[PDB]
Design an enzyme around this catalytic site. Structure first.
Site, PDB file in Angstrom:
ATOM      1  N   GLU A  69      36.469 -36.210  16.172  1.00 45.39           N
ATOM      2  CA  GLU A  69      36.796 -35.263  16.855  1.00 45.39           C
ATOM      3  C   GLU A  69      38.120 -34.929  16.977  1.00 45.39           C
ATOM      4  O   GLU A  69      38.781 -34.853  18.203  1.00 45.39           O
ATOM      5  CB  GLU A  69      35.890 -35.604  18.092  1.00 45.39           C
ATOM      6  CG  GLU A  69      34.986 -36.299  18.699  1.00 45.39           C
ATOM      7  CD  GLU A  69      34.458 -36.548  20.397  1.00 45.39           C
ATOM      8  OE1 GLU A  69      35.082 -37.347  20.586  1.00 45.39           O
ATOM      9  OE2 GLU A  69      33.250 -36.664  20.882  1.00 45.39           O
ATOM     10  N   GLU A 145      26.641 -41.179  16.436  1.00 45.61           N
ATOM     11  CA  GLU A 145      26.473 -41.488  17.640  1.00 45.61           C
ATOM     12  C   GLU A 145      25.312 -41.017  18.679  1.00 45.61           C
ATOM     13  O   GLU A 145      24.854 -39.718  18.066  1.00 45.61           O
ATOM     14  CB  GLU A 145      27.410 -40.623  18.703  1.00 45.61           C
ATOM     15  CG  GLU A 145      28.992 -41.398  17.965  1.00 45.61           C
ATOM     16  CD  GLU A 145      30.448 -41.064  18.999  1.00 45.61           C
ATOM     17  OE1 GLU A 145      31.237 -41.280  18.145  1.00 45.61           O
ATOM     18  OE2 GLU A 145      30.254 -40.953  20.495  1.00 45.61           O
TER      19      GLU A 145
END
Ligand SMILES: O=C1O[C@H](CO)[C@H](O)[C@H](O)[C@H]1O
Ligand SMILES: [Mg+2]
Ligand code: NA
Ligand code: NA
Lengths: 211, 210
Positions: A69, A145
């Site tokens: 991220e 994820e």
């Protein structure tokens, strides 16, 4: 990068490991503000290069990750190529900037659904089945994820596994995540209880989202 | 007097095992065609485009049979309605192709077309190409012709493209069948089929299987 004993135990007990650089700039606006900035290349480079220098001899490590991220910046492309050059033995992956950028060997989306498209501007999360066959796309897809296991959750878990088994290039994923990040606090009688965000006077906080 | 002996079965039947009624006979048109000795024996039309389809080159290869002569010419003209949009004239004699020369009995005409009206199932824009075989002085020997649709079909990056855009084929397979006439087709039934197809949002047909 984890405590060094983790890799020893993974080598010996047998688990495949994605070793990930300590780089996350999630709160920047836009997310790649630092990672596209050459001023921050030195700091980022050390978080990647020093991980590789430490862990490259562990058989359990099968994939390198550039972090998490932090959008997609030119610094990622530079560091992607650095790893590819020094260690051709392991694929390099990175989810930032839409999960299928030039800085990743593996399509590695987070929370892309099985059948349902989520066509966000610039960084869409396609159905994983659809993602594989986009024009020109040839890479394997492994979710970095998926199946967010927060509280009463894992609804639709079977849908992922049916797809993984049916589609050769859907090669699975990493559930988010293993263990609740709750902390122990004590009442007036010394009895322990599980605490989450905000329970320590911490503010602003994101409450139960750590579990 | 013509005499035609038609066999129901042949070695050709081994290649004609389509899932359909097995019939026989002279089931399509019979015609007589008069051509001059010096004739257009073949012609091919190609249309190539720039990146944004704002420019096209129509390329027409024309073949002749008969005696080759220096005075012979081909003119390929392109029409949009009653307006001539482009024209090319050349004597016979193709480009050198190999160590033994070229096709003396062939000629390729190249016509520029600016901002061509493009053909698709959505708007079937057509031009008319007239192929004239004539003397340098302008005496016509014969003319052949065809409808021309300016379109490019290509597969790129795993997508079938028409005029640069990815197609969505709303197709149907169609046999040549009539409940009274069998496998004999007529204009009325063909038109009936096409009208109904387009009215029901079909844009494509497969000639199953011939
Ligand atoms: O596979 C097929 O299925 C159809 C069944 O009606 C028909 O036989 C077609 O000609 C054939 O190609
Ligand atoms: Mg069949
Ligand atoms: Na699979
Ligand atoms: Na969380």
């Amino acid at each position: 990068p984890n405590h060094p004993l983790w890799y020893t135990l993974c080598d010996r007990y047998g688990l495949y490991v994605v070793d990930e650089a300590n780089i996350e700039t999630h709160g920047m606006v836009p997310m790649n503000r630092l990672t596209d900035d050459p001023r921050w290349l030195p700091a980022m480079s050390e978080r990647v290069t020093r991980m590789v220098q430490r862990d490259r001899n562990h058989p359990s490590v099968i994939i390198w990750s550039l972090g998490n991220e932090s959008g997609h910046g030119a610094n990622h492309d530079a560091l992607y190529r650095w790893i590819k050059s020094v260690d051709p033995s392991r694929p390099v992956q990175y989810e930032g900037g839409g999960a299928d950028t030039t800085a990743t060997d593996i399509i590695c989306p987070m929370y892309a659904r099985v059948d349902e498209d989520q066509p966000f501007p610039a960084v869409p999360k396609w159905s994983i089945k659809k993602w594989l066959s986009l024009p020109g796309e040839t890479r394997p897809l492994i979710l970095c994820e998926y199946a967010h296991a927060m509280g009463n959750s894992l609804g639709g878990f079977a849908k992922y596994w049916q797809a993984f088994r049916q589609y050769p290039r859907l090669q699975g994923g990493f559930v988010w995540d293993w263990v609740d990040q709750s902390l122990i606090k004590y009442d007036e009688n010394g009895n322990p209880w599980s605490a989450y965000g905000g329970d320590f006077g911490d503010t602003p906080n994101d409450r139960q989202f750590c579990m | 007097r013509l005499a035609v002996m038609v066999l129901r079965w042949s070695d050709g039947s081994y290649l004609e095992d389509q899932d359909m009624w097995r019939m026989s006979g002279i089931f399509r048109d019979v015609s007589l065609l008069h051509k001059p000795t010096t004739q257009i024996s073949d012609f091919h039309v190609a249309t190539r485009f720039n990146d944004d389809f704002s420019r096209a080159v129509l390329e027409a290869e024309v073949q002749m049979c008969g005696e080759l002569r220096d005075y012979l010419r081909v003119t390929v003209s392109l029409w949009q309605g009653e307006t001539q949009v482009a024209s090319g004239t050349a004597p016979f004699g193709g480009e050198i192709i190999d160590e033994r020369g070229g096709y003396a009995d062939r000629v390729t005409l190249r016509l520029n077309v600016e901002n061509p009206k493009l053909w698709s199932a959505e708007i079937p824009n057509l031009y008319r190409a007239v192929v004239e075989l004539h003397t340098a002085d302008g005496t016509l020997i014969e003319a052949e012709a065809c409808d021309v649709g300016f379109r490019e079909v290509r597969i790129e990056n795993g997508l079938l493209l028409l005029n640069g855009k990815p197609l969505l084929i709303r197709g149907v397979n169609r046999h040549e069948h009539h409940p009274l006439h069998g496998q004999v087709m007529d204009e009325q039934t063909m038109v009936q089929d096409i009208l109904l197809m387009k009215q029901n949002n079909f844009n494509a047909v497969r000639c199953s299987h011939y």
